[PDB]
Scaffold this active site. Structure first.
Site, PDB file in Angstrom:
ATOM      1  N   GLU A  77       0.794  -1.231   0.000  1.00 53.14           N
ATOM      2  CA  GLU A  77       0.000   0.000   0.000  1.00 53.14           C
ATOM      3  C   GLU A  77       0.830   1.286   0.000  1.00 53.14           C
ATOM      4  OE1 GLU A  77      -3.996  -1.914   2.122  1.00 53.14           O
ATOM      5  OE2 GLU A  77      -2.953  -0.309   3.176  1.00 53.14           O
ATOM      6  N   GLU A  80      -5.225  -8.776   0.841  1.00 49.88           N
ATOM      7  CA  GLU A  80      -5.965  -8.397   2.056  1.00 49.88           C
ATOM      8  C   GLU A  80      -7.417  -8.160   1.697  1.00 49.88           C
ATOM      9  OE1 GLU A  80      -4.508  -4.947   4.441  1.00 49.88           O
ATOM     10  OE2 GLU A  80      -2.435  -5.689   4.144  1.00 49.88           O
TER      11      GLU A  80
END
Length: 445
Positions: free
Chosen positions: A163, A351
């Protein structure tokens, strides 16, 4: 809803969120140790000092993994636990921990996936500018090589970064995450260096010639226009570029999104790059990891920010304890879009998960039906992507266990496993863990 028998069902965690042992056995300070020890930054003044104590309890956690029957475990490795100063001399005890962890996973027949950078930059490197200093990209690449050398033939799934959007913007523009800067120009500079460090590590991965695959993990949030308006459509498109294309286009196309790049440059001045940087960033990779949780709904609203775009709260629709809309269709949309516009490479959901108010009963039970419902709905959308041709290879639930949820501290629980922190840090399988176990066994929802 039936998945392939070799479909990689997993669970994910990250080093700072679970490990504890924050200053044990030679580990150096990270920016998250510093941030969490700063008053006012974290809810309730929580820190990652002990967390789940996974550093000491990892053998027990692997037993629970086997109980659930996951096929792969995604975890991150702490840079400052391995190289306390970010460069220089290796901390052999820090590295020995991950060698023990990996050997244990393999003996358990669980496939390791390592994320090299999941936010815990050595504080020593932060004192020299952190991600605004191009030297940090080089040190990251040297760290990557160290890990490729040590785990050659032991770990065959690798993610460089987790991320980069969140690291860049939450960490440097809005100050909600470590190191806590609030400077949008700095954010853009950091984003460029994260991307650069990614490409630099991919080059090293090829050179070292270890078997296995490398990718990057991006948080993706698809944007939807609030109305039929062509104006909302464009605004939604722009916020979409802000989160998604800003990272997807450099990696897969070798360029930043044009309109957005122009808007930034005209309001903020240009960030520093060197010729050939886009070539490094866009090196060919083996897979893309996608982190999905929710979507955004966007209306056109001139003024009030740079994109002339305002996010609408969907108060009439279900949401999790994070306040995030539950919208499973978004997961389908983003997989399809990625496969259509950006890349034909294998995709993994690295995720996906949800926080709900979990209650531990006296027999050590957690009846988290809402989490089961959330997860089931999202698995179904991943199935639908798979059925329609997307090369989806695996799905990792965030998270294996309750953990330190960044600025929210321990007040938000995402785990399949409940962690009773103050009672010997004991673990309890939630009902969602029991449900997931049945899903993996039968390959069906």
């Amino acid at each position: 809803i039936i998945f392939p028998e070799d479909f990689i069902w997993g669970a994910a965690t990250s080093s700072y969120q679970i490990e504890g042992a924050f200053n044990e056995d030679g580990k150096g300070e990270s920016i998250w140790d510093r941030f969490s020890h700063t008053p006012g930054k974290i809810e309730n003044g929580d820190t990652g000092d002990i967390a789940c104590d996974h550093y000491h309890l990892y053998r027990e956690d692997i037993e629970l993994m086997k109980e659930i029957g996951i096929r792969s475990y995604r975890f991150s490795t702490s840079w400052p636990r391995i190289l306390p100063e970010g460069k220089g001399r290796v901390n052999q005890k820090g590295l020995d921990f991950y060698k023990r962890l990996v050997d244990n996973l393999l003996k358990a027949n669980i496939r390791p996936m390592i994320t090299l950078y999941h936010w815990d930059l050595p504080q020593a490197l932060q004192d020299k500018g952190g991600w605004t200093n191009r030297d940090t990209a080089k040190y990251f690449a040297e760290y990557a090589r160290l890990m490729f050398e040590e785990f050659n033939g032991l770990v065959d799934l690798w993610v460089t970064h987790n991320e980069p959007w969140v690291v860049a913007f939450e960490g440097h523009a809005f100050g909600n995450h470590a190191p806590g800067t609030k400077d949008f120009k700095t954010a853009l500079q950091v984003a460029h260096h994260l991307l650069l460090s990614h490409g630099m590590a991919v080059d090293i991965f090829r050179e070292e010639d270890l078997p296995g695959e490398i990718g990057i993990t991006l948080n993706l949030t698809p944007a939807y226009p609030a109305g039929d308006s062509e104006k909302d459509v464009k605004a939604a498109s722009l916020l979409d570029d802000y989160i998604n294309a800003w990272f997807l286009s450099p990696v897969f196309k070798g360029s930043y999104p044009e309109e957005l790049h122009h808007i930034y440059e005209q309001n903020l001045g240009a960030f520093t790059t060197q010729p050939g940087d886009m070539d490094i960033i866009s090196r060919d990779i083996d897979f893309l990891g996608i982190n999905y949780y929710s979507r955004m709904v966007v209306r056109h609203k001139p003024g009030d920010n740079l994109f002339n775009a305002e996010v609408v709260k969907m108060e009439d629709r279900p949401s999790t304890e994070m306040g995030w809309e539950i919208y499973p269709q978004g997961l389908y949309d983003i997989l399809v879009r990625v496969n259509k516009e950006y890349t034909d490479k294998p995709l993994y959901i690295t995720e996906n998960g949800a926080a709900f108010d979990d209650k531990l009963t006296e027999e050590g039970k957690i009846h988290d039906e809402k989490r089961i419902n959330y997860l089931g709905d999202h698995f179904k959308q991943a199935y639908k992507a798979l059925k329609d041709g997307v090369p989806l290879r695996g799905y990792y639930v965030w998270s294996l266990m309750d953990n330190f949820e960044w600025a929210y501290g321990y007040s938000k629980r995402f785990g399949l496993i409940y962690v009773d922190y103050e009672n010997g840090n004991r673990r309890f399988l939630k009902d969602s863990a029991l449900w997931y176990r049945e899903v993996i066994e039968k390959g069906q929802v």
